[PDB]
Structure 1
Amino acid sequence: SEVVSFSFTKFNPNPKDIILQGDALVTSKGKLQLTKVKDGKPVDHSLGRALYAAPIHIWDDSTDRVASFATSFSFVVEAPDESKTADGIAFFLAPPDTQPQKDGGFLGLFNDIQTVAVEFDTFSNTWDPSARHIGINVNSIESMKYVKWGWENGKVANVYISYEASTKTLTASLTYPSNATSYIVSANVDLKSALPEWVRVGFSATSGLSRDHVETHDVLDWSFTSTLQ
């Protein structure tokens, strides 16, 4: 058996165990700022990602084992105008050598790819439901499952995501501690069929392609654990 685990109550401004991609950076105060901010205001056409340095062993072909993992993180999405926002933030697993994909609605993850993601989508694209949503995505920008999500501008969101290998169940929940509101969605996901044996895990986010569709995507903390046995 193999157990892997880490916790950040904040991020180091010069992170060494975090692989920063695109526009992502850590602020002096220790906030993982995925998308660009200038003069304290979010900028459009931004894409940032952040992955944990050590690959995670999610399934083994020789031993026919699949990992179970659980992760918590808090995140803020703040937009100058509440009615106009894009695009969103996601937690994702992809091959270790994963690089940023397309911007805008593709969230830095997909294009037109072996990526499984839990997205917090703030803009309705062609492949989306009408309302903002939390989605479970399996190798597509189109979610297999989603729940409508009443996004609260600038309010801290607490996320908990778990994968139970014995039942192939991935579950994601978001709670706003400010008004004790919550949402949850689950899906049946076969990690062996969606991903390679080893992955890197982390976050991706992208601001809108227009000036009037901008917002921040900041991660405040992050704890993760995975066991393969």
Structure 2
Amino acid sequence: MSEVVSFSFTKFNPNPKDIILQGDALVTSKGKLQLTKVKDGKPVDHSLGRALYAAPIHIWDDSTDRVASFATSFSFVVEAPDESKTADGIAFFLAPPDTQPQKDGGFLGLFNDSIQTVAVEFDTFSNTWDPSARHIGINVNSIESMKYVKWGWENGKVANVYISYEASTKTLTASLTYPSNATSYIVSANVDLKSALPEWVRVGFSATSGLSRDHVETHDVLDWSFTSTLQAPSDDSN
């Protein structure tokens, strides 16, 4: 009646055997997780890459009415040669363990037109279902976010992300901070993990570059820490 898992990497090892790389994703010799293709130092169009931690995570348990609380921190960089033409974005996500890459472009490698996936997206291009401004969105089994906050993307600057899920209140909270100019953004939503996802999931990142040559950008993850605890609800708190 307690299961706890954590991991933390201050950079990635170039051939990381505890990370499942999908699509174009790779780790560079200097330990950056380059989700979308970069060639000759330029980001390339029509790229999709994802990365998952090797172990599935026990996020809820039907036989005991436990639901996990979790938290994750990571830093990422999106750098674009043209700040007026950026696409498509990067996300943190949870999905069934055998999850594969879904539709490219605006679907971020996570969703499709035709899917259980919960995601926090950092969305750089306004699709038909998006607000006009770049945004941080919380997504539950749809590319259309259930709640978002407008996001002032800073080209090429390190973004520090912290995401937490409080099982007792069903509250998912996502924040981004730029240390370069000490500016931050936050959004929360009420999210029921038990109805959106299966009992076991893999967790990780997904990103796509645009579907035209002139809307390109990198989606690089520099470090990552994750913890989840599946335990019985407390009867005495408040």
Report the TM range for the smaller structure's normalisation. over 0.9
Partner residue in 2 for 1:29: 30
1:48-197 maps to which residues of 2 (within 5 A)? 48-112=49-113, 113-197=115-199
What's the TM-score once normalised by structure 2's chain length?
0.96
- Tell me how many residue pairs correspond in the alignment: 229
SS in 2 for 1:141: coil
Shift of 1:9: 0.2
Partners in 1 of 2:182 and 2:214 — Cα distance?
30
* Cα distance in structure 2, aligned partners of 1:28 and 1:90: 23
Aligned-CA RMSD value:
0.2
Which secondary structure state, in structure 2, belongs to the residue aligned with residue 124 of structure 1? coil
Work out the CA distance in 1 between the residues paired with 2:187 and 2:69.
17
Percent identical pairs in the alignment equals: 100
Paired residue secondary structure (2:162): strand
Q: In the alignment, what sits opposite 2:206? A: 204
Cα deviation code 1:45-86 (max 9, x no counterpart): 000000000000000000001000000000000000111100
Shift of 1:155: 0.3
Cα displacement (A) at 1:7: 0.2
> Structure 1 residue 219: deviation in Å?
0.1
Where in structure 1 are there 5+ consecutive unaligned residues? none
SS in 2 for 1:29: coil
For 2:42 and 2:14, how far apart are their aligned partners in 1?
19
Deviations 1:168-206 (A, max 9, x none): 000000000000000000000000000000000000000
Q: Distance in 2 between matches of 1:183 and 1:128?
A: 18
Superposition deviation, residue 151 in structure 1: 0.3
Secondary structure of 2:168's counterpart equals helix
Cα-to-partner distance string for 1:11-65 (whole Å, 9 max, x where unaligned): 0100100000000000000000000000010000000000000000000000001
SS of 2:64's equivalent?
coil
- The whole-number CA distance in structure 2 between the counterparts of 1:153 and 1:30 is 21
Q: Secondary structure at the match of 1:193?
A: helix
Aligned equivalents of 1:83 and 1:73: distance in 2? 26
Moved over 3 A (4+): none
